[PDB]
Amino acid sequence: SWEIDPKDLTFLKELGTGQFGVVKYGKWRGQYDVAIKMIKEGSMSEDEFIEEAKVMMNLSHEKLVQLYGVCTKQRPIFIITEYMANGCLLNYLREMRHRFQTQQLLEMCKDVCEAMEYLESKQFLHRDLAARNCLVNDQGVVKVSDFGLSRYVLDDEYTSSVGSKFPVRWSPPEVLMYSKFSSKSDIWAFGVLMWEIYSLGKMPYERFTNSETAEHIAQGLRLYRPHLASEKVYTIMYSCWHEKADERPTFKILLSNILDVMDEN
């Protein structure tokens, strides 16, 4: 694991708080833009994370927000990542909602699908894929962030399937019923993410509670086709939501589907 020297980090701006506490924008060695997570004491299973961190750092792809390294020889520990100037995708969609062409929306789905095809090829699960966990850079490229970190969260409202922070609206039946995560549960979440993109950042199953969402999707309720999604695009997102995990596509198949739609248009 790349153990970064904290003396090489210059903090510049607050980026707000996430599940592990404060995140800052800064520079590494006075040049490279980075984000720095300051891991709040008690928020993370730190020994577990440190033991397993190298796998995460070896994930390298243009459409992943890279985990560059860690600072662990002190308290609090730091996680150092790629910086994304336009922030999270969910907010970006909502703030620019009157400016998007449908071709740009499909390009966002392609960006995320490329990242996920790469993770799938490495047998690595995101576990919390959603627009809130994608980020956008200064050139509008969407990248997938915080892949794999859900495993290390210490927060019972997040880790309990009936907790108020659990990502129920992005979860397939086998996660809600059995806590069975797989690349096929990331597939389901990706379909919901496509829906978030094409709805310009609406909340999935808005007005339903988490338990009502779970109850109704188990019985076959599915997200409606957003106005901006063509039938071809809807067919792609809908394919992610087969009740049976083994009937869902792979990210390799989804990427091929997405490219085919692009070529036709």
Ligand SMILES: Cn1cc(-c2ccnc(-n3ncc4cc(C(C)(C)C)cc(F)c4c3=O)c2CO)cc(Nc2ccncn2)c1=O
């Ligand atoms: C890399 N990065 C991270 C963030 C940023 C800031 C605050 N909290 C977070 N979050 N948000 C959510 C989050 C979620 C998780 C789960 C394990 C999946 C539950 C784990 C995290 F570690 C975080 C985190 O750190 C992030 C996401 O990691 C913001 C950026 N950019 C900007 C730009 C402008 N304004 C604000 N932020 C940026 O480039």
